[PDB]
Amino acid sequence: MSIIAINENGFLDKIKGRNPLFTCVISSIETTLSIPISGVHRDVIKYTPSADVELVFYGKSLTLKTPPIDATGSPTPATITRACVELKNIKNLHIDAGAFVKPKIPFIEIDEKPTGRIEEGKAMNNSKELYMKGYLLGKNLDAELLIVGESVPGGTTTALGVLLGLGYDAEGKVSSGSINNPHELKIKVVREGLKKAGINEKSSVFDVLNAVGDKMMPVVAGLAISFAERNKPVILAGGTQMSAVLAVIKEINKKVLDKNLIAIGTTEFVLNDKKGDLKGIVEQIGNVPVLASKFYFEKAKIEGLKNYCKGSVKEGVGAGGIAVYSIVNDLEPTKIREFIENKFYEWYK
Amino acid sequence: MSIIAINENGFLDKIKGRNPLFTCVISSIETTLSIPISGVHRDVIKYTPSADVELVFYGKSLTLKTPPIDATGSPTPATITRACVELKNIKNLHIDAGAFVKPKIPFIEIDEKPTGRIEEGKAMNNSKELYMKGYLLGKNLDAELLIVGESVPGGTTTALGVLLGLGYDAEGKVSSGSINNPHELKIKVVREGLKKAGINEKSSVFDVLNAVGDKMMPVVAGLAISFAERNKPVILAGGTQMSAVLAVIKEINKKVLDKNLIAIGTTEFVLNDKKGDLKGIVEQIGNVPVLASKFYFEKAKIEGLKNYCKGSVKEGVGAGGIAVYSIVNDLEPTKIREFIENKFYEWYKE
Numbered sequence A: 001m002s003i004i005a006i007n008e009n010g011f012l013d014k015i016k017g018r019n020p021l022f023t024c025v026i027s028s029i030e031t032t033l034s035i036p037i038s039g040v041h042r043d044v045i046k047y048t049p050s051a052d053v054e055l056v057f058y059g060k061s062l063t064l065k066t067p068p069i070d071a072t073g074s075p076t077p078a079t080i081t082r083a084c085v086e087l088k089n090i091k092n093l094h095i096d097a098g099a100f101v102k103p104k105i106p107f108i109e110i111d112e113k114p115t116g117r118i119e120e121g122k123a124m125n126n127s128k129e130l131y132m133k134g135y136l137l138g139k140n141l142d143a144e145l146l147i148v149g150e151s152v153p154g155g156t157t158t159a160l161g162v163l164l165g166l167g168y169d170a171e172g173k174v175s176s177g178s179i180n181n182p183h184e185l186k187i188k189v190v191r192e193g194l195k196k197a198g199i200n201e202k203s204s205v206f207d208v209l210n211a212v213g214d215k216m217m218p219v220v221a222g223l224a225i226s227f228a229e230r231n232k233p234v235i236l237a238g239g240t241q242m243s244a245v246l247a248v249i250k251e252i253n254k255k256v257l258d259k260n261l262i263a264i265g266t267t268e269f270v271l272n273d274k275k276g277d278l279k280g281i282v283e284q285i286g287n288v289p290v291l292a293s294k295f296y297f298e299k300a301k302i303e304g305l306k307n308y309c310k311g312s313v314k315e316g317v318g319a320g321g322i323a324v325y326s327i328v329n330d331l332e333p334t335k336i337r338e339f340i341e342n343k344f345y346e347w348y349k
Numbered sequence B: 001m002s003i004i005a006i007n008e009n010g011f012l013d014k015i016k017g018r019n020p021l022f023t024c025v026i027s028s029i030e031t032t033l034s035i036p037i038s039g040v041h042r043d044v045i046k047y048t049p050s051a052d053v054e055l056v057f058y059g060k061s062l063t064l065k066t067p068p069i070d071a072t073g074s075p076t077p078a079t080i081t082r083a084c085v086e087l088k089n090i091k092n093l094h095i096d097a098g099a100f101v102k103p104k105i106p107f108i109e110i111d112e113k114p115t116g117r118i119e120e121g122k123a124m125n126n127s128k129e130l131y132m133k134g135y136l137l138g139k140n141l142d143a144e145l146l147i148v149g150e151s152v153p154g155g156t157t158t159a160l161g162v163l164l165g166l167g168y169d170a171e172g173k174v175s176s177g178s179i180n181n182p183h184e185l186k187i188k189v190v191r192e193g194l195k196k197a198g199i200n201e202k203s204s205v206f207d208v209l210n211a212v213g214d215k216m217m218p219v220v221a222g223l224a225i226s227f228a229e230r231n232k233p234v235i236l237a238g239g240t241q242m243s244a245v246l247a248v249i250k251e252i253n254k255k256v257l258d259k260n261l262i263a264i265g266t267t268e269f270v271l272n273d274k275k276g277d278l279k280g281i282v283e284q285i286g287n288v289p290v291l292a293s294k295f296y297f298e299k300a301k302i303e304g305l306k307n308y309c310k311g312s313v314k315e316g317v318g319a320g321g322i323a324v325y326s327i328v329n330d331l332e333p334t335k336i337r338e339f340i341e342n343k344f345y346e347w348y349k350e
């Protein structure tokens, strides 16, 4: 039907009828101000993480007059996430780990300062502290299931860097937030940063994150470990970015990862992206469920949604994973498309 | 039962066996740095709201070297709140509505800017927006019971100003965070602010808050209404400050008080404060439960706790209300005193 499952291993039955909390962890990356690594449109990238979570939580962007778009003009995947929050009454609370511009909605502040210059190997100096903060926050969140997404423009580059720094075969395998995927530029950036920071086989996961990660990653790892340690399921709601978070979790607490309570929840558009290879990254990390939602956007009435099928946007803001939860719990998939179609005119003017 | 109850109305049964979320809403008031209205010690007042929630959430204050103290040197009531969250495994997540210096723990940011000059009638310009933010946040907090506290040094003064601005008889009835309760100074501050802002019987509740409230108040009112509207109980965990919040709630949504889902949870020290009159404020607002926890601090080894019985500190950081929840759910009250005594050296090196 409307969920594509790889290595499902009973995970879907652990989430049917369970009470979720959705949280999106946001960050900005200083590199994106000067180097065109991101597929988010340059005119909105500084405002995109906060505008995304404003749309999800409040129903419209406040930091921008219309919600964000990718380079090809397709709408933010926060449109999908908002549709699911409304259609399934999903409680949502969002976390800042360094957006350039902060949300105008209530939000959880973990670190005001953006992710740094990846090409200098100076992403952050505090990845262990951010992990600890995500874990301690997670212990105070009460839900039966955590659905944790991201909005980090540039985050497919940091995902590549972290996977490479940990020793995985990831060149050419990470996705992009738009149709074009400038792999040569991304490799140049992360290889430079890994070299400058002296990353090698002996480096710890926190050294790798400090060099070329983004600040969302340790926070999400902490939240996820806090839930799985308590025997609660977690959907890492994202694409190849969440494969990097999964690799980080394996380095921090493999025993918790081995409980089989953590899955990747993404979209059909990422799973079927021929310019990357999500399934192939995950195979290197472990036997972890990969679940992808189908949207039937080929027959959407919004051209920008039809363009997801060509590679525009694909994923983000937890869209794929929140849709997996929603569809497993009985939401008819075309209700997502119809919701967006209904709200699109007022959102985009 | 170690609980003093006024107009209980069966509320104690609504909180027994329910899973709580504890949240402390923090703010700072610009007036407190210029005029000595607060009972929090002037050396630490700027840092107190954030140090309080750091103690509760993490177990250590992180900018201050030790936790806060009142003007007499007695320990912050966050000691009680920390004891309860540990002893009863209470989940907690704290909210900033304008502390001067922010927490170093994760926290929910609602408004970074402090509450302004009460004596100028310029507390804030955005009470309506702050109410809506607390309301929408509350819809996204999943708990069976909300325990909502505050840490707002100077908050007994803004409580007096809001109560007077709404037309209550409140002079001499608000409490104080230390032994001295400077009623004549407080009344001058708030009546000057009310006059400057032009507040009268035609003003809205948001006009009153914009003149002389603190930013915690509309946030808490929104949180509380969001829960009670959903048929869930709320403990307003504070003293005379929460009576002002209750009056705000009545102005915004009086019918929600008819559900009997909102109670004030405070300490014996506030209820029995002979320099204030909590019961006499609440009687003017409505038939709302007022529940007060007993601590048996007369028998403590630490002078700082014994001083609560003489009027030091009294309440704050949700201590009274979280203790009401804990005692109703079978916590032996003296385990609080004992926990504090056991950690006092780690916290204060005394």
Ligand SMILES: Nc1ncnc2ncn([C@H]3O[C@H](COP(=O)(O)O)[C@@H](O)[C@H]3O)c12
Pocket (backbone or CB within 6 Å): A037, A038, A039, A040, A041, A048, A052, A068, A069, A070, A071, A074, A075, A076, A077, A078, A150, A151, A152, A153, A154, A155, A156, A157, A175, A176, A177, A178, A313, A314, A315, A316, A317
């Ligand atoms: N693609 C997107 N388009 C419009 N709005 C978006 N908000 C998030 N994303 C998504 O794309 C970004 C990652 O892709 P890259 O590495 O190319 O920047 C993240 O922000 C992700 O959430 C968006």
Ligand SMILES: Nc1ncnc2ncn([C@H]3O[C@H](COP(=O)(O)O)[C@@H](O)[C@H]3O)c12
Pocket (backbone or CB within 6 Å): B037, B038, B039, B040, B041, B048, B052, B068, B069, B070, B071, B074, B075, B076, B077, B078, B150, B151, B152, B153, B154, B155, B156, B157, B175, B176, B177, B178, B313, B314, B315, B316, B317, B318
């Ligand atoms: N009294 C206190 N002493 C030490 N630390 C405190 N933290 C909060 N309070 C408490 O006292 C303050 C209100 O009293 P006033 O209007 O006199 O300032 C609030 O901060 C309240 O939480 C404290």
Ligand SMILES: O=C(O)c1cccnc1
Pocket (backbone or CB within 6 Å): A156, A174, A175, A176, A177, A178, A238, A239, A240, A241, A242, A270, A313, A314, A315, A316
């Ligand atoms: O692979 C990802 O994580 C991804 C792809 C497209 C857009 N946002 C994220």
Ligand SMILES: O=C(O)c1cccnc1
Pocket (backbone or CB within 6 Å): B156, B174, B175, B176, B177, B178, B238, B239, B240, B241, B242, B270, B313, B314, B315, B316
């Ligand atoms: O009356 C109050 O609200 C109060 C009294 C003392 C300390 N904190 C609050």
